[model samples]
Target: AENLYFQGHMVAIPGGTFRMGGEDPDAFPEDGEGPVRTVRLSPFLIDRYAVSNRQFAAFVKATGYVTDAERYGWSFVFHAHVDAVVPEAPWWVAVPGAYWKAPEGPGSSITDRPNHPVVHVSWNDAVAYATWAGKRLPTEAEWEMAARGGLDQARYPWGNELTPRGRHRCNIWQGTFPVHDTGEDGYTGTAPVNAFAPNGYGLYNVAGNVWEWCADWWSADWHATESPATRIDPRGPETGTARVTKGGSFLCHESYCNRYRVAARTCNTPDSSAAHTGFRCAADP
Candidate 1:
């Protein structure tokens, strides 16, 4: 394979068979954590860390890329991060001018957070960056495989215990959900891309810090319908309303969105950008 000069800090993932999804009763049925079927992937390359503000800034500088949030002039900011509130989803506040650069809306800047994973980037925005960098987003299968970090069916990238040995391994909500974050993990919001220890695969923040965009359309039971014959390198459905996102963000807590688990998944519209949503890139090896 030809090496792309722009692909940065990518880790080579040796492909193999592994069980996909989960049968845990706590798993969300609508999110499709069932049947635990075998999945296969081709050898691929994935970013060692989520895309950082500095990297995304380079893309914007080179191409003048306008993000969806910028085009839309608003994005979903966590209610705790902003003062205003959205009645429907009180946890999220629709803030104007909340793009990747201005994470907390207007007046906010990425000046001090060059290494922090760029937030407020929609799936479309992530795709734009990947394409500009001669790469692509990981498939849902690929994201889960990379996140597992050679650990079979582990709840988190590290292990089943969220804070193994009473140590905070990842940046997740430490106190009440959406009400108050104790910053126990040393972060009330997103952490640096390399905040915690890397997984067994040397990938950083695979389970927390940010929700990564994957190259798959959303479906609840699509994986359950797959046979072993069609499971190899399986991409998601050809069409769907929303795209798949994996790994929970810093806002995740056991009481609410306990989705930081390695097998856990979520989705959002192509144009929907949020303060907690960011992505890493993957490539064919």
Candidate 2:
């Protein structure tokens, strides 16, 4: 096997059989989070850190890459994460300068938040950065396996509980979302990439903080319709419009959304960048 590594902090996920999908009969019917199946993953290397602003800035500086957000006026910024001082900064309003370099629209720079996971990045932006670094996005299966941290079908990467031992495990909303965030997990938006403890797989922020873009294409039925025959190194659907995104973000809450789990899945277009969305890198053996 060729070495397709990027040379950042990485953890090795050994190949083995583990339960794949999930199902709670009481869960939402639309989500299709059910009928757990065993999946065997091949050994692979995954980036321990989410791509940071400093790293992405280097890519941009070297390649002169312009993200889709820069090309397309604005990208979605979670109203809660923006500093409260900006009275004129409307949360949902399409600001003219919201790109990977300017996360909270214009006037915002990546000075202190260099360690924070780079947001306002589209799938194309992530793809471009990965290409430069000699890596790629993790597939949904590999990501789930790494997120589970050797736990068999746990709701969260840590455990069935959200806050274990009375301590918040990951960065998530504490109060009402899209309105108010109590910062219970110590962050209202994307925290530093290593904000929480790493899972059993030695992966950090696998559950919360930001929605990570995966290499797989969006498909609700991929798991259900997949062949039972063991796959050596399965990617996902070859072609699709939206790319799969895993790990719900800081805005996720039981009152509104709880898509922050190892098995849960969501997606966005190739060019869409939101405040809560970011990415990590991975590689094959």
Candidate 3:
């Protein structure tokens, strides 16, 4: 775990074989995503972006590391701010001093977001900042083969046109979600983790502005069981209480959480924090 010379500017990927899941006008099938399989990966190294807020404030100033919304005082926020309403996810806002440097709770300030993308993180605070930047957490089939940058079953990741010629690569939810966010992809919340234009393996906001976190532990059918751990390198469902989360945030909408499709997925409760999740890191190439 000693890779951190200067973490979070990586991007090796070279892996092979793709085609994971979900497709089209709406394949969210209550979050199983799809039957689309065929995986298998080898080479690794990820994180072209999505761990910012200045590399998690330098991993809490190099490992004083206390966050699960600062030990659960509260977290969840996002209106467009809250104290209750998880009964049907009422635009969230469990508020209370929301962590990740008070995201939107106590006076709030990552001071203008030091390159953004460090939402109230949790999958155990993104594996404690990817094990203090030696790197880990990328296996939801290597975060959909590095969020399908090599583009095959493209739904989003710079293709299948969410805005190809008209342009506006990632950063989801332009207008009318939880209400008013016509930041028009310039940003309505977190945008600067190298914002847009990078895919095809260079990787930047994989499909939306946030919602990354992936290291398995949430399955809708154990990759629909066709063996070899769901076709080599799959990493999911040994046991679970929610834990995957790949691309889909900035209040992703299409009349409700349209999951920013790079084989869209969702999960939580690995000590669930919020403000739209966050993660990115992987190594061992």
In model 3, residue pairs whose N, Cα or C atoms come closer than 3 Å (at least 3 residues apart or on different chains), thus clashing, are: none
Tell me, by lDDT, which candidate is best: 1
Cα lDDT for residue 17, candidate 2: 69
Candidate 2 local lDDT, residue 230: 27
Winner on TM-score between 2 and 3 is: 2
lDDT tens readout by residue for model 3, 156-244:
87777788888788777777667788877787777888877887667788788889888888888878878887888878778989898
**Backbone collision tally, model 3:** 0
Error of 2 at 56 (Å): 0.9
lDDT of candidate model 1 versus the reference: 0.86
Off by over 4 Å in 1: 1-8, 83-88, 228-230
Per-residue error for 239 in candidate 1, Å, reads 0.6
- Model 1 reaches what TM-score against the true structure? 0.94
Extract clashing residue pairs from model 1: none
Arranged by lDDT, best first = 1, 3, 2
lDDT of 2 at 180: 82
Q: In every candidate, how many clashes are there?
A: 0, 2, 0
* TM-score of every candidate relative to the true structure: 0.94, 0.89, 0.33
Model 2 segments more than 4 A misplaced: 1-7, 25-28, 81-92, 226-232
